């Protein structure tokens, strides 16, 4: 619990009301009660405020002659409503202290302030740094080093060798540096190439749940700072992925694919490998990235849904194109 | 178990036409049936087949009895007759049985009757497990979730905190409930997190595939309708909504805030945009890129299908320069007029 | 670990020029390679770059030899040389050793000789481990499966009951396999659960990537054949059957009793429909939708490439309107033969 007015000065917004407001907690606008804080960014939501029964609301300028309450004024404010949820976060820590069932090697490095869950697992060699949290359930693997205050949910596996930064966190069921999918042939038959590169993750990293990132084959698959990585995304081995990127649920990237900064990979995207994107590129849900990206922007792909009786003479039509492109060329060369 | 063929009958409904005294000990497909089997018939084009078929009892209509060579039960619906009977001799174990000594269990926990909580299974404070729960060995379930009665996680499921499950819901190994939602707001490139302080709630006979992730909402709920059932491996986003009796095929990927009404089928591999609407009774095809509400049932697809790879060439070349195409057909138009 | 270079030539079959004596501790790329590292080459681009190589050893062919400037060992095929060395100089940690106190084994679990078993990893009743079976931490192994000998599993592997897994073979973290199927029947309009009593077969050699799924048959069984290899995040369908040696890269989804014959070759995020089947030596490149059985070899493709989104958005309101564009085009064709 926070007094309105306290809470306005740490979110350096302007108080327009009782800064003796007491709130507890963060709410949609459609389910906040008294004692919460809400927010709203569309202006659609100005004209039934008298209906929100929060105990505050952020908003802009703009929006203040609608209010019907105390209001916090920003210039942002989903921004600062990242601010005051991180203030009035209720989420729990994935362990506190050690657990007696957990199972720690003697030659494992633990800072400061260390947590460890029931019945994780922690290899030799390994270095957690002050306040990192290892959730239940959890594997880290030999000689792997996780920095200051990062965390892990119950259930998450690092491998061995595997270097992680600062303030990351990793969602429960994903995998950090499986072998990469690397063989050679002799005469038909696949011949494992042991993988002996790393992951190495930034500082600052979000990982959703049952996401894989393979180690590199020799050298190592890079994350850089700052990116979040949503649930079901599978990294290749010697991805390198450029400081502050996003990348959004279950996309698919192949071997040495280098992505830069500041890019924005939509859902379900597939993106092939030994190829770049260059900074500050966003491919849009369910894109096929076939070839390198050079200049900044938006790309999309994908025909979208039909009705089924639409879409079955869409596809036919569109798998017989050259026949129709050879006509057109036959009925130019007559006119 | 064991059970005569006449008791296996009445359970089932049907009529019998044979030996009572027949002892079944499980089911089978009809090509590997052996004596002591019960297999089914649903495909009238097998019934000068069913003398080479070695099971002791054959399911089946009334139309296929003068051709059946066994004892056999006479039913409306074979396959769902076939359904039952394998529950009945369901030879599936169960995920753990009584508490496992190695399982790690909070005091504050509260169990109900005839719980089972398997080997190094991990149970946070608060959380409540309804009568004949079992948790299978090494799951997690996290700081004041309930889990009701009846229902069952396989091994290694991760359940975070505050999420609910109702009655009778059955839960496959790797499946993640209650992760983060992708919330994140930007300033000046740097993503800055938004703590995820809603929930999810589950409800009743929902049946969730392997490694499938439910991720808890931002401030209100992601909520799954009674008698779901989605398959594995995959991603239902922040404050996604799905109406009762939806069936999700596997590797789904939706995004947040995407409402899908009852009683709609969404084909495996289909990607589906988030903050708009599916209404009831929609069917998806297989690998549907959804990027649009749907506002009328039916069926939808899209997709163009595998070629040669030389023919794919030069279907994609053309469909990508198709904006050509088009402008050299207006153009012969209006010489020809 | 460490091997002297002619040690090592000769367990490659490599032709060594170079002083033998020289210890390699391990492998490196060309960029990374230092004192006592071996590296390979396979591009002749970078001949006139050998000199900026610190590698100990660098393994190319008899036309590369004269660019060397570092002890070379000659070979046929470098690349292959390449995975054969980087298993003998294998630096990768096993999943566990010896039988660790915190897992859980059912008193009529049957081991082989040294088998390892990690910590905090359950081991249901009647399961049978082979001889030199590795089983990391947290893994799950169910009721009555089988794991032949040299198989070894990474932490967090979950195994159901009555699975059957050959020799030999490597399954990477997180994946699942012999889950239910998608099985149910319909009963006046609420769903029926079909119990899942088939179950999963895998060869020998087999190697399956992190957080796959492999489910179990419903009656008869999901079938992996000998020296298939698997990708992360694969989803195998219930009754599924994978002939020998095909490759599947990651993210593919096989829907329920599709048969895939050997030597394929399934591109990533590729989605294979079901109750069909594709021949041997198919090559489905990547993000390929196959609605319709493979019958012949050979190479197969879908789908329309990204554009710049302004120009995808006429792309595709012109693809979704092309019945019209057919139209048009009849009609002008009529016109032009005098109709
Ligand atoms: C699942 C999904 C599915 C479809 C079909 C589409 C979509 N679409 C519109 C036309 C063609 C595709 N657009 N989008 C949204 C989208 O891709 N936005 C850009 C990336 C967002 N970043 C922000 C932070 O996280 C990383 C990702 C989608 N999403
Ligand atoms: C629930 C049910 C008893 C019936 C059902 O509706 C269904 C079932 N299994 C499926 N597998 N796949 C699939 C899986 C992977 C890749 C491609 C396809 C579908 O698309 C499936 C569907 C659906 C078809 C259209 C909409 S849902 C079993
Ligand atoms: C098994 C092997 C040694 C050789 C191989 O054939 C192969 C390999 N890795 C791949 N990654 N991706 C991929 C992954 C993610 C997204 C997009 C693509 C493919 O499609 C891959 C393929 C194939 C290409 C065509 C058919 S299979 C390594
Ligand atoms: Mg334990
Ligand atoms: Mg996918």
New interface residues.
């Given amino acids: 619990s926070i007094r309105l007015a306290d809470l306005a000065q740490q979110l350096d917004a302007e108080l327009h009301g009782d800064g003796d407001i007491v709130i507890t907690?963060?709410?949609?606008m459609?389910?906040a009660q008294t004692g919460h804080i809400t927010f709203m960014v569309n202006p659609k939501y100005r004209e039934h405020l008298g209906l929100c029964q929060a105990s505050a609301v952020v908003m802009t300028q703009d929006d203040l002659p609608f209010a019907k309450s105390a209001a916090l004024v920003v210039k942002?404010p989903?921004?600062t409503?990242?601010?005051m949820?991180?203030i009035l976060?209720?989420?729990?820590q994935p362990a506190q202290n050690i657990?007696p069932?957990a199972?720690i090697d003697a030659t494992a490095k633990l800072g400061n302030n260390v947590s460890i869950?029931?019945?994780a697992?922690i290899?030799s060699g390994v270095e957690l740094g002050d306040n990192v949290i290892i959730?239940?359930?959890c594997?880290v693997?030999?000689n792997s080093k996780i920095g200051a205050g990062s965390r892990l949910?119950?259930?998450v596996?690092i491998?061995?060798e595997i270097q992680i930064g600062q303030n990351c966190?990793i969602?429960?069921?994903?995998?950090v540096g499986?072998?990469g999918?690397g063989?050679?042939?002799?005469r038909?038959?696949?011949?494992?190439?042991?993988?002996?590169g790393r992951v190495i993750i930034g500082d600052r990293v979000?990982i959703?749940?049952?996401?894989?990132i393979?180690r590199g084959a020799?050298?190592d698959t890079i994350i850089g700072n700052?990116v979040?990585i949503?649930?079901?995304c599978?990294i290749?081995h010697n991805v390198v992925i450029g400081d502050?990127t996003?990348v959004?649920?279950?996309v698919?990237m192949?071997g040495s694919l280098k992505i830069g900064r500041?890019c924005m990979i939509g859902?379900?995207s597939?993106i092939?490998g030994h190829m770049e994107i260059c900074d500050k590129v966003t491919?849009?849900?369910?894109?096929?990235?076939?070839?390198p990206?050079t200049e900044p922007?938006?790309?999309?792909?994908?025909?979208?849904?039909?009705?089924?009786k639409?879409?079955?003479?869409?596809?036919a039509?569109?798998?017989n194109?050259?026949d129709?492109?050879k006509?057109?060329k036959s009925?130019?060369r007559?006119?």
Avoid at 89 to 92: E, L, N, R, W, Y
Avoid at 297 to 308: F, R, T
Avoid at 310 to 315: C, L, N
């Fill in positions: 907690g963060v709410a949609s459609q389910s942002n989903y921004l409503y990242a601010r949820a991180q976060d209720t989420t729990p657990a069932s199972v869950g029931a019945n697992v290899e959730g239940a359930g594997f693997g030999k949910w119950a259930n596996t491998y061995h966190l969602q429960s069921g994903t995998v499986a072998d999918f063989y050679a042939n002799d038909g038959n696949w011949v494992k190439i042991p993988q002996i979000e959703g749940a049952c996401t894989t393979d020799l050298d700052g979040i949503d649930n079901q599978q290749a502050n996003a959004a649920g279950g698919i192949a500041y859902g379900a597939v092939n491919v849009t849900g369910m894109g096929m990235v076939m070839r990206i922007g938006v790309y999309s792909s994908g025909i979208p849904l039909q009705p089924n639409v879409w079955r003479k869409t596809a039509l569109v798998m194109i050259d129709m492109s006509r057109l009925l130019e007559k006119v």
